[PDB]
Amino acid sequence: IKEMPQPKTFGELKNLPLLNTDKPVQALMKIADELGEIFKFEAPGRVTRYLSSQRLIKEACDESRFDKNLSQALKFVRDFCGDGLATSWTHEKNWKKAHNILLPSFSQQAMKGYHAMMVDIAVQLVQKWERLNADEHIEVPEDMTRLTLDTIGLCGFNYRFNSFYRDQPHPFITSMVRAMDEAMNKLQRANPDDPAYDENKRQFQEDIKVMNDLVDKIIADRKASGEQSDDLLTHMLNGKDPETGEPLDDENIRYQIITFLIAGHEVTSGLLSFALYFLVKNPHVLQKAAEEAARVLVDPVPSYKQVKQLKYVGMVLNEALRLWPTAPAFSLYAKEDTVLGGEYPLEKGDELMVLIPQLHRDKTIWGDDVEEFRPERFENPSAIPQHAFKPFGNGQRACIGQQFALHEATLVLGMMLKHFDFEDHTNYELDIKETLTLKPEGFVVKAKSKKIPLL
Ligand code: HEM
Ligand SMILES: O=C(CCCCn1ccnc1)N[C@@H](Cc1ccccc1)C(=O)O
């Protein structure tokens, strides 16, 4: 039985002030560098254990021993995502019911139906960049978020956010971002009922009311029109859980839509932003990915089958997820008493955090070159040890949107590589901005058209 280490404490605040920082995930990664594969993290009324080694995480991913926990962050997000799929406990009736209903909407097979709508938005991105003047540049995360937001809006419920027509965010997005910020900022308030925060609470409720009212009207409008657009909303309005025989109710449908829009916003655009960052920093890798794009994407717009054939582009995306997974942690609890790694006894109910970026830097798995960007690591999934690579979570609670995100990202990155040469014209210094997701803040490039038509 080993005692686990613990980072520095602040008296009765315990470790909580360590997360009173602009970049808490990177702070936790530095703590893991100092303390090793496991450390205890205490706050007032809270104890968790951060895991960073594949040795321990492979045990944490044993679904017979550990189930998904709502982290404090997810408990705060649940105030506006409700019992949608990502903020539900596994034992809540609406988790399994929504899971069974929505799985066919998110499969590779469903991607064939979404493909034309994804192409629609990808073409708008390419056309924007074709239309820039000589020495203008691209604001990468900003344009990637325009693309991913528009793609989930259109595939999700046939709604055009028209992000490439505007600078100012959509009213839904304004309230979503401000609610997420309040949820993230609240992971520090010792006296949340202090009259000091009444304005934060008032604003938080107005933002929740904005999201609910707007989504509820999208649902009511679709029901009033009878239109059967083949999108996630139609699937939720018509689908029935094979187990209970029941459909989702309108309240839970709204929670799912809010959940999908958040997932498809900066969490997914972050992947594209980091991938393009690593490509311009590794010109030989960019060259190889651009050679694949040219060879495969032989038609004016890509087909579904062509996207599946962008194997090296897919490897680029997985290697970007290895280094900077954009949903950087998930939480587990012990279903029963158990011992972790032969060394750390856990009681039923004890909580674990999986620190994904640090897992993905385990040199016993990847070798000494863990910081290098080498997509070839992903040539063969059977050569990767179990539970070494977890950017989409674990088990039945893994990301339902994984195929959607990777199809979207592979399509757009392929088209980017086909149509432009890229310049890191500022020699950009990576600065990772943290919300509940991760983003290369201020990442800019110049894109020179190869003058290949879309017609
Ligand atoms: C690269 C992009 C994405 C990444 C890295 C990602 C990552 C993750 C991770 C790590 C989890 C597990 C969370 C936990 O255990 O607490 C998760 C769950 C989930 N994600 Fe994603 N996600 C991505 C894109 C998406 C998209 C595009 C959608 C939907 C449009 C989506 C919808 C969901 C849902 C509904 C869940 C909860 C699944 C369940 O518990 O049944 N995600 N995602
Ligand atoms: O350490 C994370 C990382 C957040 C990851 C969120 N996220 C969302 C999607 N992907 C990842 N959270 C913890 C933070 C914490 C720990 C102890 C005490 C108070 C607060 C938590 O929330 O309790």
Side-chain angles (χ1 to χ4, degrees), residues 3 101 140 204 213 277 312-313 322 348 353 363 398 401 409:
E3 181 177 0
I101 289 169
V140 173
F204 189 63
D213 289 349
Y277 169 81
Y312 193 74
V313 177
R322 190 183 59 84
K348 177 183 177 184
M353 294 301 305
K363 289 176 183 178

Side-chain angles (χ1 to χ4, degrees), residues 120-138 143 164-165 419-420 447-452 454-455:
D120 177 318
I121 308 304
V123 169
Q124 300 188 34
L125 180 64
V126 174
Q127 286 179 340
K128 179 179 177 172
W129 292 0
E130 296 276 298
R131 287 167 175 165
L132 296 176
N133 298 297
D135 277 326
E136 290 171 351
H137 64 272
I138 291 158
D143 280 344
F164 288 104
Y165 293 85
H419 284 283
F420 303 97
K448 181 165 147 255
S449 176
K450 292 177 176 292
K451 298 295 182 184
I452 299 167
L454 294 170
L455 299 173

Side-chain angles (χ1 to χ4, degrees), residues 92-107:
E92 274 178 308
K93 177 178 174 180
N94 281 335
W95 179 69
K96 183 70 173 175
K97 180 176 170 185
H99 172 82
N100 291 339
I101 289 169
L102 284 163
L103 282 175
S105 289
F106 278 108
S107 62

Side-chain angles (χ1 to χ4, degrees), residues 16 19 25 28 41-43 46-48 50 70-74 187-188 267 326-330 351 353 355-356 436-437:
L16 186 61
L19 302 182
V25 173
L28 287 163
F41 191 96
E42 288 182 348
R46 164 102 177 265
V47 179
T48 195
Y50 279 83
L70 306 185
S71 59
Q72 186 70 55
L74 285 180
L187 299 159
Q188 275 310 304
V267 169
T326 49
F330 57 95
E351 169 180 353
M353 294 301 305
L355 185 58
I356 306 174
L436 293 178
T437 187

